[PDB]
RNA sequence: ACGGAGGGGUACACCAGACGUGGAGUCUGCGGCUCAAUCUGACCAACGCGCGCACCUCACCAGGCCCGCGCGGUGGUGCAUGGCCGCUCCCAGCCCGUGGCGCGAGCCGUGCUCCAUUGCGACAACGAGCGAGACCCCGGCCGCGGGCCGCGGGACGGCCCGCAGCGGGAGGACGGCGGGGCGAUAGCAGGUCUGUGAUGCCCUCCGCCCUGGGCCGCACGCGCGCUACACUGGCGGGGCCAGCCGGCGCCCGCGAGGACGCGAGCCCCCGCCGUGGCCGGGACCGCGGGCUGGAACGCCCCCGCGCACCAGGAAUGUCUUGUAGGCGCCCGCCCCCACCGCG
């Protein structure tokens, strides 16, 4: 009862899927590259 | 470039048969009489028109 | 009052000419003493009080910007005359880059290599 | 005296908005960019997506309603 | 630094669109804009229920106004119509030909549909029905062409459908190719 | 049947005849942002409210979204003794 | 002005016209692997730093702005070579000697 | 489809050259070995690939709570599937309506030239579409406007010569505009259920969390790279120039690194060492001093210790202008840390 979540570490996961791994934090995007492709289109990132 | 597509050439025919009078054998002037949704497209079609004139004269 | 510019790769040279200074260091005291000749070529092949401010890129580009600026800044001295027409001719019979800026700039890098043409080695085994 | 900061990502909308405010009346462009492997996993030729996003300032040190345009006064 | 604010506006606009794509599937969601949120939808008369109760409940689920236009041409939009193909799942040929016919009457100049999944006997194949003229290259792809794809949670395996609609005629810019000479 | 106050505050974030709506960030502070009882007290009960259908849910980016029904608001009529 | 004469003459002929003991057992930076050799080098460094101040007539130079002026590489390390800065105590002290505003210091 | 069949084309594939790789140490991945575990995928088109492993990330190991001190599952099945990706191929190809030929599988439509099914011109075929091109982005020179940013002009095989177009000259900022983005039809039992509230079917109730460890273990064969093997060099003091955009003053402290506050390297110049594994080369190791962090096994700095290496077999790769190569800087994962990748 007094052990459940003691440890301190970064709580970094993607904000759309939930992946602990491969998250971009540049600019404060807080998302993963895989998730980035199908939602960057309207968040604004485009290709030129 | 070297080769002109049939889009350009199809244009050039109607354009020159419609303004035989207005067209001279130079390019600057022929631009005006061609003045199409792009300026490079304009440039190429006028380039062919300028040749069709000094080819129809002779 | 006379305005003149000069360019090499990213080097920009500004010249105010009036009836000689480069970065406050006079002509023959500019750092590359070997290329000093290269700078001084137009002055001797062809004064007024000119003044220069130049930055950008590297040493050799600074030289090819200041030199070309001074060439234009005395090319614009006489106006609408045969000297106005033949000075540029002697400059071209020295080098055409003494009037017209050099338009080459680095080509961008493309992924899978260190530069614009070098790839990485291809190993089958 | 009054400060106006007007911002938008689409050059057309931004230019329109400065054009329709003077109907009443150095902060240059910078870009928000990322590069990232195209594929989901890590198999095949290493190709890359390069995403890019420019957004603009217009500065109005003052002495139409467009959605996507942002304004702050300070 | 005035851009954290705007960037978070962008990511929250992405939020609202994807939530609306999870939820307003009943009423033909298409898209939304952030300003006072103004929404592009296929029928407003149900998203506003009787007495606006549901619309207000949504606005107050955007705390933890909302005003809505109307899609004037329903069959030109590859989103509510791909939801339509979600609905019709009924034979594939006839489903997708109705999908094409509604767009072609609505004024599409090209249209086509792609389907893949375990349609016969434990094997995925891919059907492609089609009608009229389509393009897929260069910058005009992003203006005049419209693509939309959906997963379907079938009784058996998942069913992927894509609707692609080509309109070279809008009230707008002129295709660089077509040069009407008169 | 853990804390009567916890299981009344969670209902208190439902305006009954009004139109408030609830969302849930599922951390799994450690207290809610709405009132301040723990996420855990919210989460255990909200599972049951889902089973009963006092409220319904959708889901988008790790964020539970609820919406209140007719029959569920009827249920809450007697649990908050309103009229 | 002073600009009309070159710097490689000014530094030497001004160190010939001009004094801590940490001068001994000191290298000019973590880049240089050896201490300098011409034991006139402290006069020479001081004349250099003053020839570099009198240039900057209006704005205030600083001492980190001066170690960053005197920098070179680090090598013998198997890795691609990186640029390192010099010491700070030496330049701050030379500035203090030559000193007898908003930030740093200035000429006259 | 293929042919050690003929004919016609074409590309840094070869020519002419340049820079390399394979030989040494070292970083990183793979195998094989070892292990309580050393979690796992992929064999031109796997192998600096699945965006930086003390903890978490972790799927794996030794233990322990919840419900020492239906539900979830990073369980399986990519040969049950969706989407995304790679590759055939950045190849020049694909295909419809009416008519013609044929019992039918089908065929027709589908020489001269260009980077090109780009076109000229001919034809039992006539007439359309996609792919190509056009288009978007950047960067050169010139104008109006604002205060460099943002709106336009300019370049077209146009001029003059010689024989749809191959050549030679001229002017111009640029000469046949340059670097990129996108990308047809048809598919492959490549790859990916371990990125997801994508997911069918099986199996587990292998769920969540707490501490300690492993993934980094090592005779060994591979691949991608980093620093070298010196005098076209190394060392000591000085001079001074970038761009993708970017904080630094007071001090202490040899240094690294602390406490308090406010808005570039090459190269050049001058000297030294003197062909000697030398002052080339800087691995391996022995003390100290620091930073991160709940925690060093992570990283910096100071003294000392000075390995192998004398230009590398049989083989093998890449490249035509601001290009090769040399020099350095910056961003990503990131508590700390680049030999990597994007620039
Ligand atoms: K790969
Ligand atoms: K790889
Ligand atoms: K552990
Ligand atoms: K016949
Ligand atoms: K027949
Ligand atoms: K045929
Ligand atoms: K024929
Ligand atoms: K024929
Ligand atoms: K025939
Ligand atoms: K303006
Ligand atoms: K502007
Ligand atoms: K997947
Ligand atoms: K369980």
């Amino acid at each position: 009862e007094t052990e459940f979540c003691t440890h301190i570490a970064h709580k970094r996961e993607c904000r759309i899927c939930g992946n602990y791994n491969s998250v971009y934090r540049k600019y404060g995007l807080f998302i993963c590259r895989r998730c980035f492709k199908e939602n960057a289109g309207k968040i604004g990132f485009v290709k030129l | 470039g070297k080769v002109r597509t049939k889009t350009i050439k199809r244009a050039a025919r109607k354009i020159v048969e419609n303004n035989y009078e207005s067209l001279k054998p130079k390019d600057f002037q022929n631009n005006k009489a061609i003045c199409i949704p792009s300026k490079r497209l304009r440039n190429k079609v006028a380039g062919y028109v300028t040749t069709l004139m000094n080819r129809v004269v002779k | 009052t006379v305005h003149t510019l000069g360019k090499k790769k990213n080097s920009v040279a500004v010249a105010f000419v009036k009836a000689i200074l480069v970065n406050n260091v006079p002509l023959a005291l500019v750092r590359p003493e070997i290329l000093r000749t290269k700078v001084s070529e137009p002055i001797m092949i062809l004064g007024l009080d000119m003044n220069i401010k130049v930055a950008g890129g590297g040493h050799v580009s600074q030289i090819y910007a200041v030199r070309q600026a001074i060439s234009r800044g005395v090319l614009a001295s006489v106006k609408d005359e045969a000297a106005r027409s033949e000075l540029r001719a002697k400059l071209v019979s020295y080098d055409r880059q003494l009037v017209v800026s050099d338009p080459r700039r680095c080509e961008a890098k493309k992924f899978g290599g260190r530069g614009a043409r070098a790839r990485r080695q291809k190993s089958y085994r | 005296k009054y400060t106006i900061i007007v911002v938008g990502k689409d050059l057309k909308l931004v230019e329109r908005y400065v054009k329709s405010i003077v109907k009443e009346g150095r902060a240059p462009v910078r870009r928000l960019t990322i590069t990232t492997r195209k594929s989901p996993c890590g198999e095949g030729t290493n190709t890359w997506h390069r995403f890019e996003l420019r957004m603009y300032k217009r500065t109005f040190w003052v002495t139409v309603v467009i959605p996507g345009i942002q304004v702050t006064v300070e | 630094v005035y851009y954290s604010k705007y960037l978070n506006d962008c990511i929250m606009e992405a939020e609202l669109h994807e939530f609306f794509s999870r939820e307003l599937v009943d009423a033909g969601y298409a898209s939304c804009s952030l300003c006072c949120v103004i929404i592009q939808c296929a029928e407003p008369e149900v998203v506003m229920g009787d007495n606006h109760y549901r619309l207000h409940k949504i606005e107050y689920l955007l705390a933890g106004n909302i005003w809505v236009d109307k899609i004037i041409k329903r069959g030109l939009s590859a989103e509510i119509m791909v939801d339509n193909l979600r609905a019709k799942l009924m034979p594939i040929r006839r489903a997708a030909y109705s999908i094409i016919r509604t767009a072609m009457r609505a004024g599409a100049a090209g249209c086509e549909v792609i389907v893949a999944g375990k349609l016969r006997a434990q094997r995925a194949r891919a059907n492609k029905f089609k009608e009229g003229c389509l393009i897929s290259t260069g910058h005009p792809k992003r203006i005049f062409l419209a693509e939309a794809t959906r997963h379907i949670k079938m009784r058996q395996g998942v069913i992927g459908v894509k609707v692609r609609i080509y309109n070279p005629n809008i009230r707008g810019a002129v295709m660089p190719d077509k040069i009407e000479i008169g | 049947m853990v804390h009567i106050p916890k299981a009344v505050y969670k209902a208190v974030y439902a305006h009954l005849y009004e139109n408030a709506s609830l969302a849930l960030k599922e951390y799994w502070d450690e207290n809610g942002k709405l009132c301040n009882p723990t996420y855990l007290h919210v989460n255990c009960i909200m599972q049951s409210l889902e089973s009963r259908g006092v409220v319904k849910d959708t889901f988008a980016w790790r964020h539970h979204y609820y919406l209140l029904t007719e029959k569920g608001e009827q249920f809450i009529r007697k649990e908050l003794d309103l009229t | 002005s002073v600009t009309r004469v070159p710097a490689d003459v000014f530094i030497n002929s001004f160190a010939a016209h001009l004094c801590p003991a940490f001068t001994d057992y000191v290298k000019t930076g973590v880049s240089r692997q050896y201490a300098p050799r011409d034991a006139d080098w402290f006069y020479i460094k001081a004349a250099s730093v003053i020839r570099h101040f009198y240039i900057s007539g209006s704005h205030s130079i600083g001492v980190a702005g001066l170690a960053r002026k005197y920098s070179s590489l680090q090598k013998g390390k198997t890795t691609p070579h990186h640029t390192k800065r010099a010491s700070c105590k030496v330049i701050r002290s030379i500035v203090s000697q030559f000193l007898g505003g908003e930030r740093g210091r200035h000429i006259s």
Side-chain angles (χ1 to χ4, degrees), chain A residues 1-32 34-48, chain B residues 1 3-57, chain C residues 1-79 81-125, chain D, chain E residues 1-56 58-154 157-168 172-173 175-182, chain F residues 1-5 7-83, chain G residues 1-8 10 13-21 23-68 70-96 99-101 104 107-108:
Chain A
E1 66 183 1
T2 289
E3 188 172 50
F4 272 78
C5 294
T6 62
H7 202 47
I8 301 299
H10 63 87
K11 277 74 69 177
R12 291 183 291 113
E13 65 183 1
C14 181
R15 293 180 292 173
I16 301 189
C17 45
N19 192 14
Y20 300 79
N21 286 55
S22 294
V23 176
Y24 298 130
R25 66 182 181 179
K26 186 180 289 293
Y27 297 158
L29 310 189
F30 310 124
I31 33 184
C32 54
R34 296 162 176 174
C35 258
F36 184 74
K37 310 280 181 166
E38 52 272 17
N39 296 115
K42 155 190 280 183
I43 297 169
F45 293 93
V46 292
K47 291 177 70 67
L48 278 297
Chain B
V3 176
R4 281 75 177 272
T5 301
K6 68 190 190 263
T7 300
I8 296 314
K9 292 181 181 179
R10 293 180 293 173
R13 274 69 174 174
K14 291 177 71 68
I15 297 169
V16 303
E17 66 183 1
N18 267 35
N19 304 71
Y20 176 37
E21 69 276 16
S22 165
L23 303 175
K24 281 142 145 173
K26 191 177 297 183
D27 139 70
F28 264 11
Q29 301 290 1
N30 287 50
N31 185 336
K32 183 62 82 193
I34 183 59
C35 182
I36 297 169
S38 186
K39 65 182 181 180
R40 179 193 335 271
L41 181 52
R42 185 273 304 278
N43 282 130
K44 289 198 172 63
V45 64
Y48 206 80
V49 175
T50 54
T51 300
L52 305 167
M53 269 309 165
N54 46 10
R55 207 169 173 211
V56 298
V57 298
Chain C
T1 300
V2 160
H3 294 268
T4 300
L5 276 296
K7 294 181 176 67
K8 191 62 181 103
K9 296 166 154 143
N10 296 115
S11 296
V12 191
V14 176
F16 283 141
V17 175
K18 267 207 199 73
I20 297 184
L21 290 75
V22 180
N23 311 315
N24 189 359
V25 159
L27 293 174
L29 283 72
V30 298
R31 177 70 274 172
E33 305 281 319
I34 199 175
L35 275 176
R36 291 185 290 161
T37 301
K38 184 71 172 173
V39 193
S40 290
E41 293 179 353
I43 321 180
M44 61 79 71
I45 189 170
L46 287 170
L48 282 71
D49 291 331
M50 293 177 70
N51 189 358
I52 292 276
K53 277 74 69 177
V54 65
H59 289 126
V60 193
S61 287
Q62 295 297 109
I63 314 182
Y64 287 77
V66 175
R67 182 178 181 271
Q68 189 274 331
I70 191 167
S71 296
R72 292 179 180 176
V74 176
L75 182 62
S77 178
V78 298
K79 66 182 291 294
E81 293 179 353
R84 179 67 180 270
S85 292
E86 65 181 6
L87 294 174
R88 64 210 290 300
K90 294 180 176 67
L91 282 71
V92 299
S93 89
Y94 203 62
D95 200 25
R96 158 145 182 180
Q97 300 306 129
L98 278 48
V99 176
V100 58
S101 296
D102 200 279
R104 293 179 292 173
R105 298 297 190 271
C106 277
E107 314 197 293
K109 155 182 190 83
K110 274 70 82 173
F111 64 78
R114 180 68 181 271
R117 305 273 172 61
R119 305 289 92 211
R120 200 193 83 221
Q121 315 195 333
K122 186 180 289 293
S123 179
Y124 323 127
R125 293 180 179 90
Chain D
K1 290 174 70 175
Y2 194 30
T3 314
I4 302 299
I5 310 295
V6 297
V7 175
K9 71 166 64 183
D10 186 75
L11 203 81
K12 181 267 290 180
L13 282 71
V14 182
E15 179 59 14
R16 183 178 293 171
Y17 175 52
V18 191
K19 182 67 180 294
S20 178
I21 194 53
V22 62
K23 188 269 183 182
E24 310 200 341
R26 186 193 263 141
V29 65
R30 64 193 191 51
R31 56 194 289 300
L32 279 297
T33 58
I34 309 172
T35 61
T36 179
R37 296 170 67 85
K38 274 206 253 173
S39 66
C41 49
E43 196 266 344
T45 288
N46 290 318
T47 49
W48 299 86
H49 275 167
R50 298 161 272 210
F51 288 101
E52 183 178 1
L53 180 141
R54 284 82 57 84
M55 309 184 30
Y56 317 97
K57 281 74 175 176
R58 297 292 184 270
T59 69
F60 290 106
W61 322 91
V62 175
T63 300
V64 160
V65 55
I66 297 90
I69 288 310
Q70 195 99 357
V71 176
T72 187
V73 298
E74 183 178 1
Chain E
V1 188
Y2 275 133
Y3 276 132
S4 89
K5 277 73 69 177
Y6 188 80
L7 190 84
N8 295 22
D9 290 331
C10 309
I11 191 167
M12 83 168 306
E13 202 283 308
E15 180 64 26
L16 317 161
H17 163 95
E18 61 86 20
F19 166 80
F20 280 164
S21 66
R22 297 304 154 240
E23 203 293 313
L24 276 296
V25 190
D26 53 288
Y29 168 73
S31 66
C32 46
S33 284
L34 178 140
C35 198
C36 194
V37 187
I38 298 89
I39 297 170
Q40 294 327 324
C41 183
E43 79 268 20
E45 299 217 59
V46 65
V47 175
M48 283 74 74
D50 51 55
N51 321 105
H52 289 175
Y53 176 55
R54 74 185 281 111
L55 171 71
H56 294 89
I58 301 299
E59 183 70 337
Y60 291 166
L61 183 63
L62 281 71
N65 62 50
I66 301 299
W67 206 89
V68 176
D69 286 337
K70 183 158 100 143
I71 297 169
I72 199 54
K73 274 294 199 193
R74 275 69 173 174
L76 262 63
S77 66
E79 295 80 2
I80 62 170
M81 287 288 102
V82 65
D83 268 321
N84 219 27
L85 192 57
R86 185 180 295 276
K88 302 183 271 313
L89 311 184
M90 303 297 182
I92 297 169
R93 256 193 56 91
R94 221 184 82 240
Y97 267 111
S98 172
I99 290 299
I100 299 195
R101 294 179 67 189
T102 180
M104 272 301 186
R105 182 65 61 85
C111 182
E112 61 86 20
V113 182
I114 307 94
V115 190
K118 293 181 181 180
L119 285 159
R120 182 65 60 84
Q122 63 84 30
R123 185 179 295 275
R125 298 292 183 184
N127 302 278
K128 288 166 55 103
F129 314 130
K130 183 178 184 292
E131 183 65 26
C133 196
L134 277 296
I135 47 172
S136 66
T137 50
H139 187 273
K141 184 178 184 293
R142 326 201 281 261
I143 297 88
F144 305 113
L145 183 63
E147 178 209 323
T149 187
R150 255 81 182 270
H151 295 89
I152 298 175
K153 295 181 177 67
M154 203 87 201
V158 188
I159 290 315
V161 293
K162 293 181 181 180
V163 175
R164 294 177 65 88
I165 297 169
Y166 176 74
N167 219 24
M175 197 60 108
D177 311 348
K178 182 174 72 68
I179 58 148
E180 178 154 25
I181 297 169
Chain F
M1 321 195 51
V2 176
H3 318 302
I4 320 183
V8 298
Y9 292 101
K10 309 198 271 303
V12 175
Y13 201 94
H15 286 166
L16 264 173
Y17 195 74
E18 183 65 26
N19 49 25
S21 296
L22 188 153
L24 198 148
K25 182 175 73 175
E26 61 98 20
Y27 186 33
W28 283 96
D29 203 45
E30 182 65 26
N31 297 295
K33 292 181 181 179
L34 283 71
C35 303
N36 75 328
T38 187
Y39 292 164
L40 187 86
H41 288 330
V42 176
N43 277 309
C44 284
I45 300 299
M46 294 299 291
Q47 295 297 109
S48 49
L49 322 181
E50 271 286 302
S51 66
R52 186 73 200 221
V54 65
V55 293
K56 65 182 181 180
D57 63 358
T58 61
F59 182 75
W61 306 15
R62 319 289 325 281
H63 211 170
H64 278 334
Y65 300 89
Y66 295 92
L67 188 153
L68 73 165
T69 71
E70 296 107 302
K71 184 176 180 180
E73 191 277 331
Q74 184 178 2
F75 181 76
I76 301 299
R77 298 291 179 90
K78 184 62 181 53
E79 194 47 11
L80 271 53
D81 285 343
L82 183 62
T83 79
Chain G
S1 73
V2 307
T3 300
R4 299 292 179 90
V5 300
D8 191 43
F10 180 85
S13 193
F14 194 59
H17 189 256
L18 294 174
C19 295
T23 300
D24 289 80
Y25 49 102
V26 72
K27 293 187 286 185
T28 64
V30 72
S31 162
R32 280 81 65 193
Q33 65 182 357
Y34 310 135
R37 64 161 281 211
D38 199 299
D40 211 324
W41 62 292
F42 191 106
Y43 295 8
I44 299 185
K45 176 182 298 263
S48 66
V49 65
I50 207 68
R51 187 269 187 190
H52 197 203
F53 265 45
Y54 180 108
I55 299 301
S56 296
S58 174
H59 66 301
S60 296
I61 309 96
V63 175
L66 262 185
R68 298 185 74 251
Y70 299 93
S71 62
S72 81
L73 278 296
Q74 186 189 231
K75 295 142 91 183
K77 183 62 65 68
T78 300
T79 43
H81 305 152
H82 292 28
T83 304
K84 302 294 316 293
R85 193 177 83 201
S87 66
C88 278
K89 182 267 290 180
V90 176
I91 296 170
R92 125 227 348 267
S93 304
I94 297 169
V95 175
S96 288
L99 196 64
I107 193 66
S108 185

